[PDB]
Amino acid sequence: SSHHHHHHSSSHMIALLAPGQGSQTEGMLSPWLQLPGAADQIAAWSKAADLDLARLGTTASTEEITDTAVAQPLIVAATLLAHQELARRCVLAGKDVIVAGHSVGEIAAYAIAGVIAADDAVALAATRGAEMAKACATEPTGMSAVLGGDETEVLSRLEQLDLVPANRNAAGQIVAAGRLTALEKLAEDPPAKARVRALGVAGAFHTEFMAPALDGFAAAAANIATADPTATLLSNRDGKPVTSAAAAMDTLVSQLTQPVRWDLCTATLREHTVTAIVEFPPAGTLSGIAKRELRGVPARAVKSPADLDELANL
């Protein structure tokens, strides 16, 4: 984390995207682990996070990975190992860099933007999941995706049923969150010309039902070294860039019970003339959204190291 601001001789802008939850795959660390330096870092982080990462990345079932307490650090683990190699390759030399993470991915984005250290981030993702899981055992809650019709109609409807728009990802892409009974009521009758799919998650993330998780998350968030960003770093709260480290960490914490306004992140990306987009593993969804919402901007979904190759020039 020490650098020289590149010279422009007399746009060169790349989005880096860090994935959220709900796309972690059975074999998601295999392509990265056999690379030099990765095993060492993982044992270090696995011990640092106090959960077994090396095993849970290779021969682990999707089911034991869909467990927020495991899922969260594991996603972040994969994102950083992937970025770590991208940096190492020097592919981004002389590019203006903008970074945004989804939901959990903010922890990984913060690390990519050099606000927190790689190891600390994983440890904080472990706390996030562990604390969030406790909160889920309070009241039967969940989240259900709403692939949508009329934006006004869909917002009016979650109000009636007392559910939060927990993710606002795209135009017509809303996640609803709250009590399982209220979500069943959403499913039982949706607002016309729209669909509902109960995402398999253990609680209603990014809603007020995460209060109990707040203190536990804030405690680790505070005990962590910090630095002012080395990239334009976006925040899920409003999609504005974050200037100071203190600000970022404040937002990150309070983002636990607030809507993920990823749509407004996509808006900020447009007004930067991003030339290309890189999603990190487990990549897929965020690049999908960017293909649809950001016309004519190339986007790559990193799954294996072989993908970081045709980026040498962009």
Could you tell me if 42 and 162 lie in one domain?
no
Could you tell me if 116 and 150 lie in one domain?
no
Long-range contacts of 308-313 (CB under 8 A, 24+ apart): 308/82, 308/85, 308/86, 308/89, 308/91, 311/86, 311/91, 311/276, 311/278, 312/91
Give the span between the Cα atoms of 308 and 160, in whole angstroms: 46
- Token duo for residue 19: 């994935």
Domain contains 3: no
Domain contains 212: yes
Could you tell me if 297 and 276 lie in one domain?
yes
Domain of residue 192: give its range. Answer: 139-202
Q: Within the chain, what is the greatest distance between any pair of CA atoms? A: 62
| DSSP designation for 39 | H
103 is catalytic: yes
Could you tell me if 33 and 126 lie in one domain?
yes
Segment holding 47, helix H or strand E: helix 38-49
- Token duo for residue 109: 């984005």
206 is catalytic: yes
Experimental method: X-ray
CATH code (residue 273): 3.40.366.10
Could you tell me if 178 and 132 lie in one domain?
no
Catalytic one of 23, 206, 235, 287: 206
CATH code (residue 181): 3.30.70.250
C-alpha closest to that of 199 among 125, 146, 256, 157: 146
Could you tell me if 216 and 86 lie in one domain?
yes
Could you tell me if 262 and 296 lie in one domain?
yes
Give the span between the Cα atoms of 291 and 300, in whole angstroms: 10
Q: What angle do CA 233, 102, 274 make, to 5 degrees?
A: 50
* Number of compact structural domains in the chain: 2
Domain contains 6: no
Q: Of 202, 217, 250, which residue is a domain's last?
A: 202
Side chain identity, residue 24: Q
Segment holding 293, helix H or strand E: helix 285-293
Domain contains 265: yes
Q: Of 173, 202, 231, which residue is a domain's last?
A: 202
- For residue 279, give Cα distances in angstroms to 89, 124, 221, 261: 16, 21, 25, 18
Domain contains 268: yes
- For residue 263, give Cα distances in angstroms to 125, 156, 240: 23, 19, 11
Catalytic one of 23, 103, 144, 287: 103
Give the span between the Cα atoms of 208 and 214, in whole angstroms: 10
